[PDB]
Amino acid sequence: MLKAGVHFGHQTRYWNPKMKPFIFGARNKVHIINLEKTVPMFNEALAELNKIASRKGKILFVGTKRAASEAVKDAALSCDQFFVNHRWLGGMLTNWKTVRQSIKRLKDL
RNA sequence: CUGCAUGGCUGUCGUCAGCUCGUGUUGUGAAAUGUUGGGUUAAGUCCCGCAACGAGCGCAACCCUUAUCCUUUGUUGCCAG
């Protein structure tokens, strides 16, 4: 009884063997994805993302493509969402305990 | 006597831009990345960039001298009124 959102077929190869488990087959050489290996995982994805937000968890979005470079910057006044829209800084997550000096250099503004 | 057994004290490349630490990444490791590259500089200097982000020392400056205007003043130097 489950159904796909918008999918009917998407891309050729352009390959990674690790993605084969999600791919049900092909339609005129273009690949089609398996409902049972994508839909339950996508249902969980929006459930767990909301659970982290209910636990006051800090959310980061990446919008590094032009039609998203401004939409990524806000999730309405009733919300809290961090962003990257164009460019990165090396170690800004794993070396954040040093890049906090770079953040202070901008908080100084 | 022995500074090729030593503390202290003093040269030279050179006043050349170079020597390191914390963190994150890499490699089995030595170590690299950083500190290389690009434009630029007196220069690891100043901009740019990239898995590197920052910091410490040297480097510029702080020490010494001299060049000018403006204002007030002075011995045994000066002399416009």
From Swiss-Prot:
Instruction: Give the source's domain of life in one word.
Output: Bacteria
Disulfide links within the chain: none
Membrane-crossing ranges are none
Residues where N6-succinyllysine occurs? K107
Q: What function is annotated for this protein?
A: Required for ribosomal protein bS1 (rpsA) to bind to the 30S subunit.
What is the annotated quaternary arrangement, including any partners? Part of the 30S ribosomal subunit, contacts bS1. Some nascent polypeptide chains are able to cross-link to this protein in situ. In collided ribosomes contacts ribosome rescue factor SmrB.
Spell out the family assignment given in the record's similarity comment. Answer: Belongs to the universal ribosomal protein uS2 family.
Name this polypeptide is given: Small ribosomal subunit protein uS2
Organism in which the protein naturally occurs: Escherichia coli (strain K12)
Part of the whole protein covered: 9 to 117 of 241
